[PDB]
Amino acid sequence: MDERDAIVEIRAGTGGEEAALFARDLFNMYLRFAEEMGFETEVLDSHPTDLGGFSKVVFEVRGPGAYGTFKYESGVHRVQRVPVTETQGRIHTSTATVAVLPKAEEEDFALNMDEIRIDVMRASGPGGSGVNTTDSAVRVVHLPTGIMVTCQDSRSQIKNREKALMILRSRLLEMKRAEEAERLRKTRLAQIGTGERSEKIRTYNFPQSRVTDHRIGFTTHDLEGVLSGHLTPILEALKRADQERQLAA
Amino acid sequence: MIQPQTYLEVADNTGARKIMCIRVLKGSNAKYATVGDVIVASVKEAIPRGAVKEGDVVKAVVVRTKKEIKRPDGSAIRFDDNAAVIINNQLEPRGTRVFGPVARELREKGFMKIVSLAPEVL
RNA sequence: AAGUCUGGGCUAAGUGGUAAAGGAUGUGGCGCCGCGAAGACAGCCAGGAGGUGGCUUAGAAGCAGCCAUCCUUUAAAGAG
RNA sequence: CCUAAGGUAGCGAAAUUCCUUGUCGGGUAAGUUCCGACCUGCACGAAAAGCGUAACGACCGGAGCGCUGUCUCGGCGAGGG
RNA sequence: CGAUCAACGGAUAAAAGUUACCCCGGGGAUAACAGGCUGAUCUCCCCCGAGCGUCCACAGCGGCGGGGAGGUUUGGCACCUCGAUGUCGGCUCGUCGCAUCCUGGGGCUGAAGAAGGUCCCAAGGGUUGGGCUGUUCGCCCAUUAAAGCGGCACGCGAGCUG
RNA sequence: AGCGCCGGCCAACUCCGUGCCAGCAGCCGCGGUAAUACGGAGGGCGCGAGCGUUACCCGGAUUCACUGGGCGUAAAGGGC
RNA sequence: CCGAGGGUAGGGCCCGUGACUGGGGCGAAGUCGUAACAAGGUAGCUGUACCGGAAGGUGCGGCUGGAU
RNA sequence: AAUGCUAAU
RNA sequence: GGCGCGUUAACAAAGCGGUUAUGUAGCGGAUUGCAAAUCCGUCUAGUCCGGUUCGACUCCGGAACGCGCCUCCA
Ligand SMILES: [K+]
Ligand SMILES: [Mg+2]
Ligand SMILES: [Mg+2]
Ligand SMILES: [Mg+2]
Ligand SMILES: [Mg+2]
Ligand SMILES: [Mg+2]
Ligand SMILES: [Mg+2]
Ligand SMILES: [Mg+2]
Ligand SMILES: [Mg+2]
Ligand SMILES: [Mg+2]
Ligand SMILES: [Mg+2]
Ligand SMILES: [Mg+2]
Ligand SMILES: [Mg+2]
Ligand SMILES: [Mg+2]
Ligand SMILES: [Mg+2]
Ligand SMILES: [Mg+2]
Ligand SMILES: [Mg+2]
Ligand SMILES: [Mg+2]
Ligand SMILES: [Mg+2]
Ligand SMILES: [Mg+2]
Ligand SMILES: [Mg+2]
Ligand SMILES: [Mg+2]
Ligand SMILES: [Mg+2]
Ligand SMILES: [Mg+2]
Ligand SMILES: [Mg+2]
Ligand SMILES: [Mg+2]
Ligand SMILES: [Mg+2]
Ligand SMILES: [Mg+2]
Ligand SMILES: [Mg+2]
Ligand SMILES: [Mg+2]
Ligand SMILES: [Mg+2]
Ligand SMILES: [Mg+2]
Ligand SMILES: [Mg+2]
Ligand SMILES: [Mg+2]
Ligand SMILES: [Mg+2]
Ligand SMILES: [Mg+2]
Ligand SMILES: [Mg+2]
Ligand SMILES: [Mg+2]
Ligand SMILES: [Mg+2]
Ligand SMILES: [Mg+2]
Ligand SMILES: [Mg+2]
Ligand SMILES: [Mg+2]
Ligand SMILES: [Mg+2]
Ligand SMILES: [Mg+2]
Ligand SMILES: [Mg+2]
Ligand SMILES: [Mg+2]
Ligand SMILES: [Mg+2]
Ligand SMILES: [Mg+2]
Ligand SMILES: [Mg+2]
Ligand SMILES: [Mg+2]
Ligand SMILES: [Mg+2]
Ligand SMILES: [Mg+2]
Ligand SMILES: [Mg+2]
Ligand SMILES: [Mg+2]
Ligand SMILES: [Mg+2]
Ligand SMILES: [Mg+2]
Ligand SMILES: [Mg+2]
Ligand SMILES: [Mg+2]
Ligand SMILES: [Mg+2]
Ligand SMILES: [Mg+2]
Ligand SMILES: [Mg+2]
Ligand SMILES: [Mg+2]
Ligand SMILES: [Mg+2]
Ligand SMILES: [Mg+2]
Ligand SMILES: [Mg+2]
Ligand SMILES: [Mg+2]
Ligand SMILES: [Mg+2]
Ligand SMILES: [Mg+2]
Ligand SMILES: [Mg+2]
Ligand SMILES: [Mg+2]
Ligand SMILES: [Mg+2]
Ligand SMILES: [Mg+2]
Ligand SMILES: [Mg+2]
Ligand SMILES: [Mg+2]
Ligand SMILES: [Mg+2]
Ligand SMILES: [Mg+2]
Ligand SMILES: [Mg+2]
Ligand SMILES: [Mg+2]
Ligand SMILES: [Mg+2]
Ligand SMILES: [Mg+2]
Ligand SMILES: [Mg+2]
Ligand SMILES: [Mg+2]
Ligand SMILES: [Mg+2]
Ligand SMILES: [Mg+2]
Ligand SMILES: [Mg+2]
Ligand SMILES: [Mg+2]
Ligand SMILES: [Mg+2]
Ligand SMILES: [Mg+2]
Ligand SMILES: [Mg+2]
Ligand SMILES: [Mg+2]
Ligand SMILES: [Mg+2]
Ligand SMILES: [Mg+2]
Ligand SMILES: [Mg+2]
Ligand SMILES: [Mg+2]
Ligand SMILES: [Mg+2]
Ligand SMILES: [Mg+2]
Ligand SMILES: [Mg+2]
Ligand SMILES: [Mg+2]
Ligand SMILES: [Mg+2]
Ligand SMILES: [Mg+2]
Ligand SMILES: [Mg+2]
Ligand SMILES: [Mg+2]
Ligand SMILES: [Mg+2]
Ligand SMILES: [Mg+2]
Ligand SMILES: [Mg+2]
Ligand SMILES: [Mg+2]
Ligand SMILES: [Mg+2]
Ligand SMILES: [Mg+2]
Ligand SMILES: [Mg+2]
Ligand SMILES: [Mg+2]
Ligand SMILES: [Mg+2]
Ligand SMILES: [Mg+2]
Ligand SMILES: [Mg+2]
Ligand SMILES: [Mg+2]
Ligand SMILES: [Mg+2]
Ligand SMILES: [Mg+2]
Ligand SMILES: [Mg+2]
Ligand SMILES: [Mg+2]
Ligand SMILES: [Mg+2]
Ligand SMILES: [Mg+2]
Ligand SMILES: [Mg+2]
Ligand SMILES: [Mg+2]
Ligand SMILES: [Mg+2]
Ligand SMILES: [Mg+2]
Ligand SMILES: [Mg+2]
Ligand SMILES: [Mg+2]
Ligand SMILES: [Mg+2]
Ligand SMILES: [Mg+2]
Ligand SMILES: [Mg+2]
Ligand SMILES: [Mg+2]
Ligand SMILES: [Mg+2]
Ligand SMILES: [Mg+2]
Ligand SMILES: [Mg+2]
Ligand SMILES: [Mg+2]
Ligand SMILES: [Mg+2]
Ligand SMILES: [Mg+2]
Ligand SMILES: [Mg+2]
Ligand SMILES: [Mg+2]
Ligand SMILES: [Mg+2]
Ligand SMILES: [Mg+2]
Ligand SMILES: [Mg+2]
Ligand SMILES: [Mg+2]
Ligand SMILES: [Mg+2]
Ligand SMILES: [Mg+2]
Ligand SMILES: [Mg+2]
Ligand SMILES: [Mg+2]
Ligand SMILES: [Mg+2]
Ligand SMILES: [Mg+2]
Ligand SMILES: [Mg+2]
Ligand SMILES: [Mg+2]
Ligand SMILES: [Mg+2]
Ligand SMILES: [Mg+2]
Ligand SMILES: [Mg+2]
Ligand SMILES: [Mg+2]
Ligand SMILES: [Mg+2]
Ligand SMILES: [Mg+2]
Ligand SMILES: [Mg+2]
Ligand SMILES: [Mg+2]
Ligand SMILES: [Mg+2]
Ligand SMILES: [Mg+2]
Ligand SMILES: [Mg+2]
Ligand SMILES: [Mg+2]
Ligand SMILES: [Mg+2]
Ligand SMILES: [Mg+2]
Ligand SMILES: [Mg+2]
Ligand SMILES: [Mg+2]
Ligand SMILES: [Mg+2]
Ligand SMILES: [Mg+2]
Ligand SMILES: [Mg+2]
Ligand SMILES: [Mg+2]
Ligand SMILES: [Mg+2]
Ligand SMILES: [Mg+2]
Ligand SMILES: [Mg+2]
Ligand SMILES: [Mg+2]
Ligand SMILES: [Mg+2]
Ligand SMILES: [Mg+2]
Ligand SMILES: [Mg+2]
Incomplete structure (x- = not known):
């Protein structure tokens, strides 16, 4: 929701070291813009280039109503200029990608013992008269999913029930952490895409001091101000x- | 007298050659299937490009049995093999032709289309 | 083996003759205020209304959720 | 950082894998076994040899065909008791 | 004066393992099976009524807590049995309990009908065949009115299997 | 009266819009804010009840060479 | 007797498909290096052999399509 | 001794 | 669960009852067309709780966490 704290992921697209340099240009733009809007910013993951740029930078925007504003910058941003890494005074069209995401909770995971069945039974293998007559083996079933864990590592039904529940949770946790990854992934590719020159959402053309946003048909010429925060x-x-x-119908 | 594991020839053109009985669809625990009784079977042998294929779990009505069928007029009939016509859940045949004779019992048990398509009814 | 012994009382559950939180117009007995022929309690006969909803709601208008629950014909009628 | 040096080729859920009936594929109507793969190998590995190998085996797995009183499911008959 | 004779009343000046190749003398003075006591664990049932259920605590549910029943599991204890109480699973043969899987009879339903949910009565009878695995257990296939859960030395080896 | 075409091959050019987008394309290549190469327009070229596209055959291809090719270093002398 | 064809059993060739696996082509940007073209900074190339993250390195022989 | 230099006549 | 080991800054990893660890990174400067390599400088610390002591990262006890080994006769 537009009122949640947001997480901005700026990655370098097509353009090599100049893409990473322009990635830093987007980076200082959002930080400064955020400060002017009141939002706090903390960096979480940075991957700098020794030329001054970033292969990737991930920072949060901490303030009431961050996803409301920053959500509009998700996509491929096109630069066109004469790179500082170019020697024959050429104009190179390079790109950066910016992904914006709603800050996730954490949500502690706990077993609901009412959707869990625990079977006890005789074990297998060695143990003489003991293994013959002891319900030391444990099964544990997560009844909605059906995934189970069995354990007869010890001779104690209690130590085995404990080790089986612990594993059932750890496994369910990974299944839960993995469906989220799929969601976090399909969502990023809905924003960043391949990062190509096309798929562009907004061009920054330095030779003509122009900044166009191709979704709405808007262009300004305050490029120095745009790249400084006045977004x-x-x-x-x-x-x-x-x-x-939103005009129906 | 057909039971699970029993192999039956297929007297239609579905492409099935041999079905192996896996259930007698007669109540809770019928031991045997005779003429007119529906069974469930898996298709053990078939011919290429037919409707059914090797491995399907189909239904079928027994049309010919090697154990003699007894009759109220005191006679009995015996066939050289166990045969079945593969049907759908509405009890109708799924092929378009029935090969060989069939027991007249099938008439009195609702399998007219099978009795119709059969070349001889004994 | 020795009382179908005597006198007073309780229990109706075969409780006696196997159990807890807790539930109950079981039964008996003590209390303590309360209301009554300023006609009580129960039943029954009515009045049980009106400005009509107040934030919320296309109606929620006496009869979802929120706000406090004004007053008159009065013997009393609650914006319930 | 440590060590005397940090497992090479080959092989690997194995006569070795605890989690485990791992996962995927195959076979079956259905396969904790089986076969083929994958490799986070609990705890393979190079003459206590490593990986293969035609032939051989009253060795130990898995599958099909044939055929059956093993079975559905028992019946009768023979002889010695 | 010389003792971590520290196993600190200190066996020698001088001493570690292993036995499934094992052995004898003993013990139910003491473990593993079963029983017993107990019931933490396990299974089942209640009390309370916060909250859910559009509305509505109680159709179906029941936060935080509370009280119990049973004697299937895992334990605690070490009481008969160590001059022997044969131990898993299967097979066979049953019999009992009822906290009932089906079938019979009911009340409530958030029960239109059909089909369910939930609880009450009820133990007469019934409660299938297969794939995997030694399995119990569990998963799966195909059915079914249903494919019940337990006790009987986890019933039953002077009945079989192994 | 329509259809194709107007960067070069190849006959036929200018204005607007677009701004490596939208699109063009047989090859070489056009398009990233002054495009005869995209789209429309005016004009032009070519054919005309037809004009283009696609598929295929032969040609251009002396690029399987009989006519009519090659093998030191371009593909090509067999290790002897 | 022959005989369409049906059945049985074992071969041959071909096509599709398969967990997984091997490399190959391609890409206006990534990671590690810098093997080759200058004597390319150790002349290169070569057949083979052994080894190595990788390009490669080294041994033996060969070639000049090698510099000064 | 001494590595590297993407991508728009 | 028992027994042993540990927890230090950006990372990895040491000594120490009072006190610049160190390596690499990072930061400032130089050199370089630029980036590296290089050179000159520079810097961020001890898991919680309770003890002992003048003073605790250091010693004692407990907690959380991670690692290692064992869990056998039935
Ligand atoms: K032993
Ligand atoms: Mg990154
Ligand atoms: Mg350059
Ligand atoms: Mg339970
Ligand atoms: Mg056991
Ligand atoms: Mg086993
Ligand atoms: Mg043993
Ligand atoms: Mg036991
Ligand atoms: Mg047939
Ligand atoms: Mg077919
Ligand atoms: Mg088949
Ligand atoms: Mg098949
Ligand atoms: Mg048919
Ligand atoms: Mg036939
Ligand atoms: Mg009397
Ligand atoms: Mg008297
Ligand atoms: Mg009573
Ligand atoms: Mg009594
Ligand atoms: Mg009683
Ligand atoms: Mg009571
Ligand atoms: Mg009382
Ligand atoms: Mg190893
Ligand atoms: Mg090595
Ligand atoms: Mg080697
Ligand atoms: Mg290896
Ligand atoms: Mg493996
Ligand atoms: Mg496996
Ligand atoms: Mg192996
Ligand atoms: Mg191993
Ligand atoms: Mg395993
Ligand atoms: Mg195992
Ligand atoms: Mg499985
Ligand atoms: Mg399969
Ligand atoms: Mg087959
Ligand atoms: Mg499988
Ligand atoms: Mg088997
Ligand atoms: Mg295998
Ligand atoms: Mg793995
Ligand atoms: Mg070995
Ligand atoms: Mg050795
Ligand atoms: Mg060995
Ligand atoms: Mg050796
Ligand atoms: Mg050997
Ligand atoms: Mg081998
Ligand atoms: Mg060979
Ligand atoms: Mg062999
Ligand atoms: Mg062999
Ligand atoms: Mg042999
Ligand atoms: Mg042998
Ligand atoms: Mg031999
Ligand atoms: Mg078979
Ligand atoms: Mg067989
Ligand atoms: Mg067979
Ligand atoms: Mg017999
Ligand atoms: Mg006999
Ligand atoms: Mg006899
Ligand atoms: Mg000592
Ligand atoms: Mg002593
Ligand atoms: Mg001593
Ligand atoms: Mg003393
Ligand atoms: Mg002494
Ligand atoms: Mg001495
Ligand atoms: Mg000693
Ligand atoms: Mg000894
Ligand atoms: Mg011993
Ligand atoms: Mg031994
Ligand atoms: Mg041995
Ligand atoms: Mg011996
Ligand atoms: Mg002996
Ligand atoms: Mg002896
Ligand atoms: Mg002995
Ligand atoms: Mg003895
Ligand atoms: Mg003795
Ligand atoms: Mg004694
Ligand atoms: Mg005792
Ligand atoms: Mg003693
Ligand atoms: Mg004992
Ligand atoms: Mg015992
Ligand atoms: Mg004992
Ligand atoms: Mg015990
Ligand atoms: Mg016993
Ligand atoms: Mg015991
Ligand atoms: Mg006993
Ligand atoms: Mg109890
Ligand atoms: Mg009790
Ligand atoms: Mg309890
Ligand atoms: Mg109760
Ligand atoms: Mg209540
Ligand atoms: Mg509510
Ligand atoms: Mg209600
Ligand atoms: Mg509860
Ligand atoms: Mg209690
Ligand atoms: Mg109790
Ligand atoms: Mg209790
Ligand atoms: Mg309880
Ligand atoms: Mg008991
Ligand atoms: Mg018991
Ligand atoms: Mg014990
Ligand atoms: Mg016990
Ligand atoms: Mg005692
Ligand atoms: Mg004993
Ligand atoms: Mg005796
Ligand atoms: Mg005795
Ligand atoms: Mg004895
Ligand atoms: Mg005895
Ligand atoms: Mg009852
Ligand atoms: Mg009923
Ligand atoms: Mg009923
Ligand atoms: Mg009902
Ligand atoms: Mg109804
Ligand atoms: Mg009820
Ligand atoms: Mg009954
Ligand atoms: Mg079985
Ligand atoms: Mg089988
Ligand atoms: Mg089983
Ligand atoms: Mg099991
Ligand atoms: Mg029913
Ligand atoms: Mg059912
Ligand atoms: Mg079954
Ligand atoms: Mg029983
Ligand atoms: Mg027993
Ligand atoms: Mg039993
Ligand atoms: Mg027994
Ligand atoms: Mg017995
Ligand atoms: Mg025996
Ligand atoms: Mg037994
Ligand atoms: Mg006996
Ligand atoms: Mg006996
Ligand atoms: Mg006995
Ligand atoms: Mg054995
Ligand atoms: Mg044996
Ligand atoms: Mg034209
Ligand atoms: Mg032309
Ligand atoms: Mg021209
Ligand atoms: Mg065109
Ligand atoms: Mg542009
Ligand atoms: Mg323009
Ligand atoms: Mg231009
Ligand atoms: Mg233009
Ligand atoms: Mg053109
Ligand atoms: Mg044009
Ligand atoms: Mg041509
Ligand atoms: Mg020609
Ligand atoms: Mg050619
Ligand atoms: Mg010629
Ligand atoms: Mg030529
Ligand atoms: Mg030559
Ligand atoms: Mg012939
Ligand atoms: Mg023929
Ligand atoms: Mg024929
Ligand atoms: Mg193929
Ligand atoms: Mg080089
Ligand atoms: Mg070289
Ligand atoms: Mg160089
Ligand atoms: Mg070099
Ligand atoms: Mg070189
Ligand atoms: Mg030199
Ligand atoms: Mg060489
Ligand atoms: Mg070397
Ligand atoms: Mg170097
Ligand atoms: Mg590089
Ligand atoms: Mg490079
Ligand atoms: Mg360049
Ligand atoms: Mg330290
Ligand atoms: Mg550290
Ligand atoms: Mg050090
Ligand atoms: Mg030290
Ligand atoms: Mg200090
Ligand atoms: Mg310093
Ligand atoms: Mg330092
Ligand atoms: Mg510096
Ligand atoms: Mg520099
Ligand atoms: Mg402290
Ligand atoms: Mg202190
Ligand atoms: Mg500390
Ligand atoms: Mg401490
Ligand atoms: Mg031992």
């Missing part, structure tokens, strides 16, 4: 077409 123009212009979009 509030384009956001409002985006919000407008979004409200004009």
